Design a protein around this ligand. Structure first.
Ligand code: GDP
Length: 164
């Protein structure tokens, strides 16, 4: 079966690592010290291997971040629903991915994480309008309750499958 390399990007603290660890290990972590992990899953009846590359801890413009992005086939662009700044930063990460892959057509999913937390500052309509402007899906997640987590990563695999 095919292996899919998925890279998780977003501002520090939005939950890249907690999402990754929930996907792989089925546990929520209160802290993560920065990173790649593999797991076999079945998506739409089709077995595949996920290789998740977590950019947590990499400096904003590091050579290793660029290598991670070059290696990736699809990207999760994560913000936190309780952090307007991290939502405003999404364009930065999208631009970086486009530069590194040297393409305007890169499989991506927009992920609004921490949807369990009370203090929402980003509406689902704002996020869906950004996603719509990029032509990509939007998925709301909580690494803590597991809502949306599988759906985010699996939707990204579906996007890659549509790209090849
Ligand atoms: N309540 C809640 N906390 C989260 C969620 N995702 C991550 N966290 C927490 O937010 C902090 C940052 O998460 P981390 O995964 O290290 O963020 P990263 O820097 O983007 O990798 C930690 O204290 C995590 O427990 C979530 O969906 N809900």
């Amino acid at each position: 079966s095919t292996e899919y390399k998925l890279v998780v990007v977003g501002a520090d603290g939005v939950g890249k690592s907690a999402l990754t660890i929930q996907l792989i290990q089925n546990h929520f972590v209160d802290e993560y010290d920065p990173d790649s992990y593999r797991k076999q899953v079945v998506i739409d009846g089709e077995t595949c291997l996920l290789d998740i590359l977590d950019t947590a801890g990499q400096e904003e413009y590091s050579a290793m971040r660029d290598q991670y992005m070059r290696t990736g086939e699809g990207f999760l662009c994560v913000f936190a629903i309780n952090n307007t700044k991290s939502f405003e930063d999404i364009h930065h990460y999208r631009e970086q991915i486009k530069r590194v892959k040297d393409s305007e057509d890169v499989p991506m999913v927009l992920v609004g994480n921490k949807c369990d937390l009370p203090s929402r500052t980003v509406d689902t309509k704002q996020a869906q309008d950004l996603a719509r402007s990029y032509g990509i899906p939007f998925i709301e997640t909580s690494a803590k309750t597991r809502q949306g987590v599988d759906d985010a990563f699996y939707t990204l695999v579906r996007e890659i499958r549509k790209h090849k």
